[PDB]
Amino acid sequence: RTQSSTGTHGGYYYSFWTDNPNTVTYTNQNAGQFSVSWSGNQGNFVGGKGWNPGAARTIKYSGTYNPNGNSYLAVYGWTRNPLIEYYIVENFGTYNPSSGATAAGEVTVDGSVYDIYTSTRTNAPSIEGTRTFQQYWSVRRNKRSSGSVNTGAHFNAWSNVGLALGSHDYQILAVEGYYSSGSATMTVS
């Protein structure tokens, strides 16, 4: 029982995915606002608002992020040609989502050091189907739940590590949860 919802709402691209619709409620609100509540420590989901296509833009976000367990708050997106999945992780709960990726340096932007990681996913689900693709991570040391993200500084930092980003697909401010509970109301602009 999976559910995937995408579209435009309030002028923004949105995306929500879960493998347990009964324990997660995603709510589109006005402009770049959305809310998610999840309970019962059951199910995997990722949802938020942003743009399609993405770009090297400054993403402003604010709101409240209240996880209880495995969860993260991230700018999240894809490029094509080449196919890349990327994460700018602003906050997380009890598990660091970059675990198992390869350490690849540091970048200082937007008031914090971010640790950079790279990984390869082999025949894994992608926006193009089952593929082998590269992943980039920047993980903020100084966790926060509101501020601005200069995505181009991350894109430039990643391009000195491995393959450069391709043509942008979607780009969202995502809340994720994995067999946990919590609530969040965020606004992107």
Paired sense of beta strands 71-80 and 58-68, if any: unpaired
Catalytic choice (90, 106, 128, 176):
176
User: HEC profile for 33-87?
Assistant: EEEEEECCCCCEEEEEEEECCCCCCEEEEEEEEEEECCEEEEEEEEEECCCEEEE
Euclidean distance between CA atoms 114 and 107, whole angstroms: 5
DSSP 2: -
Instruction: List strands edge to edge, sheet with 12-18.
Output: 3-9, 12-18, 44-51, 167-178, 71-80, 84-92, 131-140, 112-124, 102-109
Is 90 an active-site residue?
no
Is 176 an active-site residue?
yes
Is 37 in contact with 183 (CB distance < 8 Å)? yes
| Domains within the chain, CATH numbers bracketed | 3-187 (2.60.120.180)
Residue with tokens 């989901």: 45
**End-to-end C-alpha distance for the chain, whole angstroms:** 32
Catalytic choice (85, 90, 106, 128):
85
Euclidean distance between CA atoms 11 and 168, whole angstroms: 19
The tokens for 15 are 């995306």
For residue 151, give the nearest of 80, 65, 77, 98 by alpha carbon.
77
